[PDB]
Design goal:
part of a larger assembly, 8 chains, A mainly alpha, B mainly alpha, C alpha+beta, D mainly alpha, E mainly alpha, F alpha+beta, G alpha/beta, H mainly alpha, A: mainly alpha, 53% helix, rod-shaped, F: alpha+beta, 2 helices, 6 strands, 22% helix, flat, binds magnesium ion, Small ribosomal subunit protein mS31 (chain H), disease variant (chain E), ribosomal protein (chain E), ribonucleoprotein (chain E), Small ribosomal subunit protein uS14m (chain E)
Chain lengths: 100, 154, 199, 66, 101, 138, 132, 131
């Protein structure tokens, strides 16, 4: 639904501005969209979604063993685990458990 | 008609900060800026002045000791532009091959004992050590008197 | 204990003269320090038959981004030292009409200042180039061909061609591209193709 | 909390000295600095957006506060 | 040291998907057009299907980074509604207040 | 009495390259607190007046983003908690600046940007026609 | 009944600070925010990473200065700088405070790759706003 | 003085250490807030103002034409036919991508060249000649 003049002017402008020049259907235009953006898996929001829980936990465990960080929570579960040994509720040996 | 554009003015990245600093003078009511500006924490004597700074420096040394002891925990770089000075330091030789090129590393790291031992091993193997490399080893050995430079902790 | 517990010294606002050089106390942006600010400022919603809380240990005053380092006295002293860095605007360019005659092209760029460890902002790369087609040496054919090539980039009411570029990573690359697009548009508009006779 | 008369007198002395410091900070005449100038200075130096004005930083005469 | 095994499985999926993203994009482009021969597009269909299952981006779940809650998460803060409210109601999120109008 | 005798002024070197000409700078500042934007405006306008810069200030309309969350940890769907983030604006419009003047003013006011305030600086630069566009080559 | 961040009435013997006495519907009315950054402004990025950092810093300072903190932290971000303002008590010796300030500023600067300052303000005892 | 010093020759340990002693005589503690900001700026810790969002990022010193004009890289591919049309769509998308470096964009194109070289036999069956 375009005149030859209008069609040829649109093709010249598309070449000037770096757009698709050959006639391309909407299905094949997805190839252009695929390579003009980063894949969702490659975006920093995606692969850096979580904080590095290994670093935070391990750093603060090392700082506790060094005497520079007081972990009130870990102190709480160390006292509970200590009172369970005196009560006899100790974790069994792996493999050599109650069942066999 | 012609319009005359003024010539550009160029200054260092710290020039504006230095211009603003010139406008202010020392505050006589305050202790030196290095100290915490708090009546309980301000040094109240010449001795506390020295000891309070030594305590702060000790804290910084302890932090640096941890950073270099556990580089893994401080390797996530989120700074843009990158800040090289805020990264962990690696003081150990990473070239394990016995060669003259690998020896140069130990001299750059100032490992007097490692370098001397490796130089001896290199000489026993019979490989050639350049005069410049030998001179660099002598510079390291002569300057420090064949004694290890002080380190944070072993 | 050999002595008693360390006693806090009196606040140093008691040593401050009422005609001091205040900019020397707060040279740069710093948190509100009750012992350094000689003002009986109070803050906090008062309890019944009560008064707003005093400044010592007042966390509400600590939460404010204060302007104690930017008193009118300091700002005037600061700007006197910064006059050496400034250059003089060309006196000829009195009005906007005069600016357009001598400098037809306008380049818009944006810088974004946020707080955080990274300065990067993907919006800073965009460059916008504006030029009125009346400032370009375009004949009748060239002007008509240009308006058809650019499309909605041209505004008939203002007669302004707006070229926005954001293809390249950097702003300098998008600026070089914007200038290049204007160049090829100008030269192509002047070129006459044989198929143009089918209009 | 009870405010004895001696305490109020010490608070008035503090307000007068602070009032002179505030005029010195803003580069104005200590002798013609009014309460409406104090409020304007406090608003600039300690900008608070809290919707309730009674929670904002205030520097008033002790007679009006206590 | 992740909140639970479920979060740990999502961490591995995000890592594997990142490693394979370029290869998946390249193969998928071969399939998402009518230009190339169908014989070639059929071989690409098999190749992308042979990649490890955990490289598929649709398998990633936006879990709360603090508690691992798989639903009720606000994407801007990556926090569950419960954790977000706990931080917001204590005044620890800059500029977030209770809305009344 | 203990006053510095002489002061080393920072070296500002006049270059042989011509300076940039900015027709306009649009300093849009965003914040959650209106009083903090009032103080920043007073500071920014005073700094502009002392440096000889023409400045005009207006307040673009505020943006209030609201969203809803569940009241309870479990069930009770009818009960919600509604939060919002208010973004207030102030726009400083500078005019007829050179590259050096803008560099100094922007460094000064950007370094003193109060915590919780963002800035977007739109710079309109005056340029001359490219050399290649003076006449057609065909 | 609502529960969120409400210190409930006791016998009139529980001392509460000014922050702990105000429920969440006062956060922009009578009390301010304990953190000020640009993440949550319209059109601004990285609100999520700022939030995680704030949560870590409040935990770090609680355990690094055990029993010293007299109220909640005030976190300030200006450009590249991070400033932690803490109201502490006057029980720990000054030497130990200076050590911990030098240690925390260095360790946190290397962890978050930015200049970090710690501004301590000491109080003789916890500031009581009211007795609930 | 000496007309030309041995700048190319690296400093010995003695020269380096002596230069460290000359930086200590002039070493004093920070005197105010401005001086701390100046030190941080010199070390690279504090951002340099006015803020430049591209500070420290020059994508390999690439030019605008290396990102936008990518047909030089399609010279090994068939000049006509489906593979040409397809690769023209790939390069058009790549030319519109501000998130990839030139190196990354050329890697995409290089992958397709090898892929179509692996699939020559399949392509011949469908009336396509690759290389
Ligand atoms: Mg899903
Ligand atoms: Mg209800």
């Amino acid at each position: 639904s375009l005149s030859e003049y209008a069609f040829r002017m649109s093709r010249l402008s598309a070449r000037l501005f770096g757009e698709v020049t050959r006639p391309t259907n909407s299905k094949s235009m997805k190839v252009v969209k695929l390579f003009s953006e980063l894949p969702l898996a490659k975006k920093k929001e995606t692969y850096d979604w979580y904080p590095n829980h290994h670093t935070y936990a391990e750093l603060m465990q090392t700082l506790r063993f060094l005497g520079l960080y007081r972990d009130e929570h870990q102190d709480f579960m160390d006292e509970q685990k200590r009172l369970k040994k005196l009560r006899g509720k100790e974790k069994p040996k792996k493999g050599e458990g109650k069942r066999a | 008609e012609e319009v005359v554009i003024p010539k550009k003015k160029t200054w260092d990245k710290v020039a504006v900060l230095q211009a603003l600093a010139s406008t202010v003078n020392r505050d006589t009511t305050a202790v030196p800026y290095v100290f915490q500006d708090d009546p309980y924490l301000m040094p109240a004597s010449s001795l506390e002045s020295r000891s309070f700074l030594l305590a702060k420096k000790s804290g910084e040394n302890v932090a640096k000791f941890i950073i270099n002891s556990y580089p893994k925990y401080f390797q996530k770089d989120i700074a843009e532009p990158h800040i090289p000075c805020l990264m962990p330091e690696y003081f150990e030789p990473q070239i394990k091959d016995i060669s003259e090129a690998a020896l140069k590393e130990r001299i750059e790291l100032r490992k007097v004992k490692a370098s001397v031992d490796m130089f001896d091993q290199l000489l026993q193997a019979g490989t050639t050590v350049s005069l410049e490399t030998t001179n660099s080893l002598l510079d390291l050995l002569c300057y420090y008197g064949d004694q290890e430079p002080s380190t944070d902790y072993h | 204990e050999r002595p008693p517990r360390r006693k806090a010294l009196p606040p140093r606002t008691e040593k401050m003269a009422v005609d001091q050089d205040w900019p020397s106390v707060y040279p740069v942006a710093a948190p509100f320090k009750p012992s350094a600010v000689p003002l009986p400022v109070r803050m906090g919603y008062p309890v019944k038959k009560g008064v707003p809380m005093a400044k010592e240990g007042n966390l509400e005053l600590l939460k404010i981004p204060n302007f104690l380092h930017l008193t009118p006295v300091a700002i005037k002293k600061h700007c006197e030292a910064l006059k050496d860095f400034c250059t003089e605007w060309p006196a000829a360019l009195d009005s906007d009409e005069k600016c357009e005659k001598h400098f037809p092209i306008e380049i818009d760029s944006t810088d974004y200042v946020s707080s955080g460890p990274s300065v990067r902002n993907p919006r800073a790369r965009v460059v916008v180039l504006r030029v009125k087609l009346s400032s370009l040496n375009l004949d009748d054919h060239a002007k008509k061909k240009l308006i058809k090539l650019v499309g909605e980039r041209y505004c008939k009411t203002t007669d302004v061609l707006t070229i926005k570029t954001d293809r390249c990573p950097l702003r300098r690359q998008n600026y070089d591209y914007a200038v290049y697009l204007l160049t090829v548009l100008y030269h192509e508009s002047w070129n006459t193709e044989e198929w143009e006779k089918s209009k | 909390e009870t405010y004895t008369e001696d305490f109020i007198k010490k608070q008035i002395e503090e307000f007068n000295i602070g009032k002179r410091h505030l005029a010195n900070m803003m580069g104005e005449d200590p002798e013609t600095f009014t309460q409406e100038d104090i409020d304007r200075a406090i608003a600039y130096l300690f900008p608070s957006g809290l919707f309730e004005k009674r929670a904002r930083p205030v520097m008033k005469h002790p007679e009006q506060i206590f | 040291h992740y909140v639970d095994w479920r979060m740990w499985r999502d961490v591995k999926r995000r890592k594997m998907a990142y490693e394979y993203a370029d290869e998946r994009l390249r193969i998928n482009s071969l399939r998402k057009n009518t230009i190339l021969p169908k014989i070639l597009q059929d071989v690409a269909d098999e190749e992308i299907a042979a990649l490890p299952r955990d490289s598929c981006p649709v398998r990633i779940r936006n879990r709360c980074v603090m508690t691992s809650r798989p639903r009720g998460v606000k994407r801007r803060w990556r926090l569950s509604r419960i954790v977000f409210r706990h931080l917001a109601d204590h005044g620890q999120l800059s500029g977030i207040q209770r809305a009344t109008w | 009495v203990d006053v510095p005798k002489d002061l080393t002024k920072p070296v500002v070197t006049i270059s042989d390259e011509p300076d940039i000409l900015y027709k306009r700078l649009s300093v849009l500042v965003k914040g959650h607190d209106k009083a903090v934007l009032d103080s920043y405006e007073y500071f920014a306008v005073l700094a502009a007046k002392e440096l000889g810069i023409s400045i005009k200030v207006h307040e673009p309309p505020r943006k209030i983003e609201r969203f809803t969350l569940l009241q309870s940890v479990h069930i009770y769907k009818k009960h919600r908690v509604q939060y919002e983030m208010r973004t207030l604006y102030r726009c400083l419009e500078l005019e007829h600046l050179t590259g050096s003047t803008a560099d100094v003013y922007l460094e000064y006011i950007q370094r003193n940007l109060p915590e919780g305030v963002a800035m977007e600086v739109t710079k309109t630069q005056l340029e001359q026609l490219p050399e290649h566009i003076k006449e057609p080559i065909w | 009944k609502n529960r969120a961040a409400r210190v409930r009435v006791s016998k009139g013997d529980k001392p509460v600070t000014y922050e702990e006495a105000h429920a969440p519907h006062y956060i922009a009315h009578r009390k301010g925010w304990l953190s000020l950054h640009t993440g949550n402004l319209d059109g601004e990025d990285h609100a999520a990473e700022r939030t995680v950092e704030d949560v870590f810093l409040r935990k770090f300072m609680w355990g690094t200065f055990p029993g010293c903190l007299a109220d909640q932290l005030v976190l300030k971000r200006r450009g590249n700088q991070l400033e932690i303002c803490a109201v502490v008590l006057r029980q720990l010796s000054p030497h130990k405070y200076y050590f911990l300030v030098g240690y925390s500023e260095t360790l946190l600067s290397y962890f978050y790759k930015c200049p970090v300052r710690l501004h301590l303000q000491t109080v003789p005892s916890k500031v009581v706003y009211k007795y609930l | 003085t000496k007309e030309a010093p041995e700048t190319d020759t690296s400093p010995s340990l003695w020269d380096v250490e002596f230069a460290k002693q000359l930086a200590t005589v002039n070493e004093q503690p920070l005197q105010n807030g401005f001086e701390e900001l100046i030190q941080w700026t010199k070390e690279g810790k504090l951002w340099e103002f006015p803020i430049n969002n591209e500070a420290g990022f020059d994508d390999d010193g690439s030019e605008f034409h290396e990102h936008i004009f990518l047909e030089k890289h399609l010279e090994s591919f068939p000049k006509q036919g489906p593979i040409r049309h397809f690769m023209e769509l790939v390069t058009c998308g790549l030319s519109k991508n501000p998130y990839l470096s030139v190196k990354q964009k050329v890697e995409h194109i290089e992958w397709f060249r090898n892929y179509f070289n692996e699939k020559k036999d399949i392509l011949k069956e469908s009336n396509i000649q690759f290389n």
